[PDB]
Design a protein around this ligand. Sequence first.
Ligand code: HEM
Ligand SMILES: [Ca+2]
Ligand SMILES: [Ca+2]
Length: 306
Amino acid sequence: QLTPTFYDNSCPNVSNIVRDTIVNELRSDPRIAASILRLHFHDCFVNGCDASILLDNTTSFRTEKDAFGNANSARGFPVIDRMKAAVESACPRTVSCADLLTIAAQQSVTLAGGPSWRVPLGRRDSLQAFLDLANANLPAPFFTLPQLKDSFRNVGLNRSSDLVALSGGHTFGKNQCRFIMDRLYNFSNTGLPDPTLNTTYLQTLRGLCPLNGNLSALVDFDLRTPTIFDNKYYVNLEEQKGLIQSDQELFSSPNATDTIPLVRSFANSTQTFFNAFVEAMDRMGNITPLTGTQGQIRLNCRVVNS
Ligand code: HEM
Ligand SMILES: [Ca+2]
Ligand SMILES: [Ca+2]
């Protein structure tokens, strides 16, 4: 059983060390908080939160960093290396990379203005990486609501609240033009833009992502508060201003009878959203963890101990 007090005796200053690292990095990279939260998400959706995503290539297994959902997208790995080294200095061979990344995600959310809470701890590090599993398990922006639900259920998150609350992670961070080109110019081979995208916002997005333009150009997930962790993400959905297909479907999908009330509830109250987000985050952080003597306490998050 994971517990928030896991390192209260062995490394009481772990959370503080993680926080300081992120505070320092935010000065040169204001996007790092969002990037770190996403790393935790992609870690947990593949064999659980076991730091498998942090592993680099080996001749026996491929890195998850080359998965369609991570390649030329996932970032912040050097920052994780930095806090790991700092934590190793303060508490040698004590904090797992899996736990470190979980704390980093929570601290990132709080630093961005989100809720503050103590995450359950006690996770251990994987002995291998899972590229095929990452390609199969990570959801894509073009997923329909049924597919999004399937993706979450596949890893153990059955609740629509899990999906709606965790999608709130898009209240900050960036998204490449490549992922919305269809919504802007030819959605579902209709030759027309996605009808669920607000027409005024459509114009703005087309200006940022012209046809045949730079597909790697970055756009803000939340047009209201691009870098602040708040409930504005849901207010956007209510106005048909969700950026990617998977965002807007939470409010507009024919299958959204169960998610619409959640979107509204989170848009109506910051407290309701924050509570639901913490609840969902801890549930996601509880996905098939290695505990006790299973796995290791990786010293270098990029490689298995030898
Ligand atoms: C529900 C399905 C989801 C899909 C299909 C999805 C898809 C995406 C895509 C397409 C990007 C843009 C990547 C890029 O352009 O490089 C992204 C970024 C991001 N996602 Fe999601 N996401 C989902 C759920 C989540 C969840 C559950 C969280 C965390 C609680 C999360 C947090 C983020 C953050 C913070 C970013 C910004 C990262 C950065 O700017 O570096 N996402 N997501
Ligand atoms: Ca993992
Ligand atoms: Ca925001």
